[PDB]
């Protein structure tokens, strides 16, 4: 199943936000934990071969999750006062090179000091 939907399997019902809700894909309506489901397939991972390209893509997401103040769209309103924790659920393929894992782990640590938990899952 798609990565975004797979992320929902481990989360309480009603958590799924309407499409393109900034960077947030899921919202625990009771606890306030937000989840952003990001995925990198084999082709995109291969495409971002130049240094810092992988780090950028992830950092680009991290900044949005962290600098989030308020979003209101598709008849739904969410602001940062509601959010108690922020997390990026990242899917990475098997052809991820060591050099690319270096960028991944770098973004993980960047996000953590940005107050964002970056959780990486290796997809077969």
């Amino acid at each position: 199943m798609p990565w975004e939907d797979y992320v929902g399997k481990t989360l309480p019902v009603g958590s799924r936000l309407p499409p393109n809700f900034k960077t947030y894909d899921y919202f625990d309506r009771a606890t306030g934990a937000v989840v952003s489901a990001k995925s990198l397939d084999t082709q995109t991972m291969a495409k971002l071969s130049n240094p810092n390209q992988v780090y950028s893509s992830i950092k680009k997401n991290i900044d949005v999750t962290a600098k989030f103040e308020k979003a209101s769209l598709s008849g739904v309103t969410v602001n940062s006062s509601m959010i108690t924790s922020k997390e990026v659920r990242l899917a990475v393929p098997v052809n991820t090179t060591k050099a690319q894992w270096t960028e991944i782990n770098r973004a993980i640590e960047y996000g953590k000091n940005q107050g964002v938990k970056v959780t990486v899952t290796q997809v077969k």
Binding site: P12, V13, G14, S15, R16, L17, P18, P19, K22, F27, R29, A30, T31, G32, E69, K70, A71, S72, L73, S74, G75, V76, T77, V78, N79, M82
Partner: protein, 174 residues
């Protein structure tokens, strides 16, 4: 941490002012069981304020489903279809369609083009009216201060005071 609240949402372009009931818990969203008040942009602060209060009275303090793995408020109700992502988008599309047909827009881009949005929340503590920055046509967001530009009113505010505060927030939109 979470206390019982009531919500509403205000959309305003040149042609109208639209107040809808929002419902939820942490997040709040268009309630298909809530009420809508349409008005001309020159509605009195009394009427406009009673429009906001009547909409708030129909707001629900509700979660998608019961949770056992955590603490949940003893007052909260449950409604899975409200929170359902497909139903959410579809009732939004109907909300949008009804406005284009009513005002003869014949296009979504002219509907939202000159549209500002204000968030309303109410609890035991205060009535908060929050302006937004019209980021994209169908996306509003942070103004973005922290968040000093909100219109915060007493819970005992008169309807006229509430309608007046709403217009103050509408003039603070970016």
């Amino acid at each position: 941490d979470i206390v019982k609240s009531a919500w509403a949402s205000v959309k305003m372009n040149t042609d109208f002012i639209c107040v809808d009931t929002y419902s939820g818990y942490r997040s709040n969203q268009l309630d298909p069981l809530g009420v809508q008040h349409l008005s001309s942009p020159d509605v009195s602060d009394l009427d406009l304020g009673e429009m906001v209060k009547d909409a708030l009275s129909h707001s629900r303090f509700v979660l998608p489903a019961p949770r056992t793995d955590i603490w949940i408020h003893p007052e909260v109700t449950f409604d899975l279809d409200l929170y359902d992502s497909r139903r959410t988008v579809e009732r939004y599309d109907e909300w949008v369609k009804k406005l284009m047909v009513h005002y003869g827009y014949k296009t979504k881009r002219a509907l939202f083009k000159d549209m500002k949005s204000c968030d309303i929340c109410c609890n035991h503590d205060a009535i908060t009216i929050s302006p937004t920055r019209h980021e994209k046509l169908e996306v509003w967001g942070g103004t973005g201060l922290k968040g000093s530009d909100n219109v915060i009113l007493s819970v005992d505010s008169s309807p006229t005071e509430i309608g007046a505060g709403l217009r103050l927030a509408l003039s603070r939109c970016k």
